[PDB]
Design an enzyme around this catalytic site. Sequence first.
Site: not given
Ligand SMILES: O=P(O)(O)OC[C@@H](O)CO
Ligand code: NA
Ligand SMILES: [Zn+2]
Lengths: 334, 334, 334, 334
Positions: A94, A200, A262-263
């Site tokens: 990601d 997000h 994305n989830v």
């Molecule tokens: O950075 P995290 O691990 O909180 O996850 C990243 C994505 O879910 C959105 O930036």
């Molecule tokens: Na969301």
């Molecule tokens: Zn994202």
Amino acid sequence: PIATPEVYAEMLGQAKQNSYAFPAINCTSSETVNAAIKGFADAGSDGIIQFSTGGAEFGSGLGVKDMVTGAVALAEFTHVIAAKYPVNVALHTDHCPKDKLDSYVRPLLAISAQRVSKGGNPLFQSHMWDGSAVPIDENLAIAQELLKAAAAAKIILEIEIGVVGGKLYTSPEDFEKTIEALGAGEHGKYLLAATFGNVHGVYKPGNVKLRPDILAQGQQVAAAKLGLPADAKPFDFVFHGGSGSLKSEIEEALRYGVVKMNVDTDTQYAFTRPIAGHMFTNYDGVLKVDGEVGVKKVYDPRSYLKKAEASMSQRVVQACNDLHCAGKSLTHHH
Amino acid sequence: PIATPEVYAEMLGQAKQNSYAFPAINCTSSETVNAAIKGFADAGSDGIIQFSTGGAEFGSGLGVKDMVTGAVALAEFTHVIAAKYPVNVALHTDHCPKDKLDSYVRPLLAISAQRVSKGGNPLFQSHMWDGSAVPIDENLAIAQELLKAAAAAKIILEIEIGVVGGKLYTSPEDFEKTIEALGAGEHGKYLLAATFGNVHGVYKPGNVKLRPDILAQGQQVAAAKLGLPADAKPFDFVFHGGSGSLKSEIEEALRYGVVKMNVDTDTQYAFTRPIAGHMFTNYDGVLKVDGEVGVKKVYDPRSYLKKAEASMSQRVVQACNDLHCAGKSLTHHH
Amino acid sequence: PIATPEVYAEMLGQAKQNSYAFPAINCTSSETVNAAIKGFADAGSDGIIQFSTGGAEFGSGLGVKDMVTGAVALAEFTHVIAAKYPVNVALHTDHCPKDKLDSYVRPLLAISAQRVSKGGNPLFQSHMWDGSAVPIDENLAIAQELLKAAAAAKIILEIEIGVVGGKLYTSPEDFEKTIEALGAGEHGKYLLAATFGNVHGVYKPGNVKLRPDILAQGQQVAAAKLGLPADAKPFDFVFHGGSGSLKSEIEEALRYGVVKMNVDTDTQYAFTRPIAGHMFTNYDGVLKVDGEVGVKKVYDPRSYLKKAEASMSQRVVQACNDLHCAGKSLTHHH
Amino acid sequence: PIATPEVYAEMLGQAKQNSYAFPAINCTSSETVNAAIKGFADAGSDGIIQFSTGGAEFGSGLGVKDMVTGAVALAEFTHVIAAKYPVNVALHTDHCPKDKLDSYVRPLLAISAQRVSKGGNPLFQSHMWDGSAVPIDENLAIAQELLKAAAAAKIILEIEIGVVGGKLYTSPEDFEKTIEALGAGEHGKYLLAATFGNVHGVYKPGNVKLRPDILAQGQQVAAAKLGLPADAKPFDFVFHGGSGSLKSEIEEALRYGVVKMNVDTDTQYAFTRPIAGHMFTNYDGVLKVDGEVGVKKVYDPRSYLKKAEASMSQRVVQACNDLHCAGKSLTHHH
Ligand SMILES: O=P(O)(O)OC[C@@H](O)CO
Ligand code: NA
Ligand SMILES: [Zn+2]
Ligand SMILES: O=P(O)(O)OC[C@@H](O)CO
Ligand SMILES: O=P(O)(O)OC[C@@H](O)CO
Ligand SMILES: O=P(O)(O)OC[C@@H](O)CO
Ligand code: NA
Ligand code: NA
Ligand code: NA
Ligand SMILES: [Zn+2]
Ligand SMILES: [Zn+2]
Ligand SMILES: [Zn+2]
Ligand SMILES: [Zn+2]
Ligand SMILES: [Zn+2]
Ligand SMILES: [Zn+2]
Ligand SMILES: [Zn+2]
């Protein structure tokens, strides 16, 4: 199995052709990986497992925190697991901004290039370049160079134009520049995270205001550039910030060429929720209270983490239904 | 790094020669593996990570539950992680009874034999055959055959005589039969879990009554059989049921040739304890209460699992101190 | 029933003659009063209910906070309740320093004087003057004047020399001045809280170091002043800070003329403990979670407060046993 | 102050004339009584405190459980408290069926008759006869006899026709029989709990279906019997099951002569809610954990019960606003 590059390209091609999408579930551990894959399998669905930079760092342990190490360790775990399921599972990384390219995406790409190299398949089937914080021309310069490297390693590149909230709101010019720099798949498949008011996290169901028409117009802008009929969908879109979305918002986005949603936040809540319940109901078993020694059967981490896994799996089946990929695995195990 | 067979044999040889031992920590996941290795590193100590049959099944996920799959997936995870630490970490499988040999130890052995075969090292550095539920002659017949297979794959075999509680109480005849059937290492290194009142689990500090003199007499019985001086220690002993033991009991066992003490229950409590605390103090963040949406920052599994990891690591350093292997890693990183 | 002045004087006289004592339980509410009296009854014991200044203020509600109001309201509640039990219950007010005399002890005394006055009995059967923060001569000047007023209202006065911790450590001179100013009961019964290392609260069983010999020497100092045999016990002592004391410390204090031991902290823990347990085990009934409406049967305050009451009552029976007044109620209901 | 009979009759007369109502809050303790009165005062409102049979039994303690004792003890507590507030507070007893008349309502009535008798006011200002489980003629025979006794003691009688759920649904004939047997206040004031789909408890906001038109037609039926104009409101209605009602349902009921709305479940939730929160956030203070001694400051019952009281008071102000009696106390303290 793990998705081969050819089956991952077929997955995305089928989803697009049929206006459905795959959940891309952020995982951080053996348990969350297991929960996500079981969710895909339970839904008769193919799916995507992704590691963020922070998820990969967490995966590597407090004594390492190294992104590549965590991503490789979790990817090798997942390769062994996914071989035992009759659905296809793709591995993805990601958001990776410019200053982490040298310590995340580039080294992982080099690892896959060497596997490919020796006649094998890449370790990950896609990687995200998130250049949304730099000017569009620089974003797309880096993107073009990464696309060539990724395609040579049999890997799909995800890119981002516009910022996902935690302006929002991808512009016509950005859509046109994207098609101009990268084409429409002839130079290597790419996935486009065009932003349209996505955020997000999860907020009260009223709060986040999505504008999927932005995606519809991006498809028209591209189709015009390419001299295609006005209903063509040249982009494969990625829907970031999927948790907390209304069903109707998800449905509308699918109509405009979203192939990946994305989830993270919602599967986090699902995982944690029965762990919380377990600690409360078993408070005097998980704590040594009033001179007692607690109760091993309820402080054994597996006792609550099996419940966490099953609950996260259920939320992943819900995502496969919401995205209409449930029952559609390309393995055709019915 | 992962312990090569040669460094694992050196580890056990050094421990025995110097009357210290290594913790063998039961792990079930990426997080618990990470916590255990960080504990070894923090203590400047080498150490052992082990997977029980139930831990391996849990590791493979609710959609698999397959022992080999879980053990392989967790072992591959651990190989990537352990390369980033300057201590040696050995991989072991815990208690495997007769009816699980064909679905756990034997397939894992065959996987290592093929690696060895191709000029590589085994995936695990030791495996346990727990034949304590069958008559001693059958236990030791199976043991002799497995020892040959394990030694050929550069793997140390652990065996058990006597039952660990959850009679107790290994007999003179059993010690003598063991040396007769297997020798004292010339036919391949083995570790002996001789039981001496050990119990798996933790009870009120009064309850479990250990008899380490049983180990002392087993050493004398063997030394006599081998025509050795009466103070020789021909066996490398394994102390099962380590959690909840008094320091003085641990010290006495070390004097009699214990080189490996198994701990699970205490590191379970250590892991779970701050997760419990996290859920209580953040009850209205981990639960969606009174029409609110919870608080992502505290229902993100990493928020409490980082605390679980650090706490389990601290308990692993305590085990390295209790066993006197802290500060003694054969890598000599001081 | 409520203890009449005559039965309260008989209670204290019997306790002293037989080297036993009564628990004086701090209460704050209808529930805690009910729990304390049920504890006395369950132990076949007479007992004392006391209200501190903060307990009385709490009793009057957040919209009043007035000490007299709270003490009167709780005392009237207790009068109705205690009539239904076959043990004697005395009402007392706890520590009142100089600057609260005009707003607590003096008005309550005037209320009892008017009842007495009309041929009735006082509302409270004893009141505490805590003059330990002022010089001994001023303490005892106020004490002498209050003793006359209390005796005229058929009320026993408790006084304090030395400070109870939260120096410690009553001096010979203070014991002698007390007997000189007040005599030994001929001018009205008084209770003496002489301090001997007592501390309010509960600490780890090691921490508080009691010196009951201080009480023994106070008895000898007084007996000498009064020209009595050296084993006479002219003082009726009060043991403050009773919670967390060792049984052996309680036993030793009883030998030296302690007739009243104050307990608050331990009955607080006993009351709260099952309320805590109730909230954890019924977390999803006492909270409206995930869009649900909770469960009335477990958020009904009576559901957990009945458990709180029974638990506090059990701790009060323990105090009656520890103090050897269990089975000794002057009503002789066996 | 406590409402004198004359001010209670004025309260109800004013409420009816102006289409507002008073909350009747079920209380069980000193704390809940304090919370309710503070709520009335905070809203500048008069109000009613009521004790159910189970609340009175709880009030008397586990060592008594006697309804009269609990009701008297709590009523005497409330008399002292209410004198310190500048609003009028009425005391009421809730549902008493036929087989509890001899052990609750009748003895309490006899206590008030003797006070009246001596030139004083009654202890309670109203009592409920709940005859809804017997045939209407028997209900109203008992009612007529009780009304005479209550009026002679300066006490208002509440009666019930129709059953409150936990058919629903008072009939025209029952309204007419009521006016015929009892008149319209000339023979003593009575309050009528006519049922109209009310349910005790709280369910998901959709579930309970109220039919206030039943009350409107009961007023018309009575007005016709009495030869009054068709808009007259001869009945003073009581709304049982008030918790969980929509504002619009409350408003509509007020239009038809409801002068009293009973609330229990919602003030229970309000009381318990911060106690729950207190136990979770202070889990390691209210429990003795890992060999520690807990934290007195958070296991002191007052620490969480002050929060319970304030929260219940806030819900009582909400009820005064919902019922439009806020700001209308007959003491005119503005
Ligand atoms: O950075 P995290 O691990 O909180 O996850 C990243 C994505 O879910 C959105 O930036
Ligand atoms: Na969301
Ligand atoms: Zn994202
Ligand atoms: O079977 P487990 O996973 O509970 O662990 C096994 C050992 O710790 C003792 O049998
Ligand atoms: O002031 P309180 O209400 O905490 O209680 C007082 C006694 O228990 C000791 O000072
Ligand atoms: O019986 P209770 O004490 O639960 O309360 C009675 C009313 O609230 C309704 O019956
Ligand atoms: Na143990
Ligand atoms: Na104490
Ligand atoms: Na209701
Ligand atoms: Zn198919
Ligand atoms: Zn074991
Ligand atoms: Zn060294
Ligand atoms: Zn005190
Ligand atoms: Zn007797
Ligand atoms: Zn009711
Ligand atoms: Zn006014």
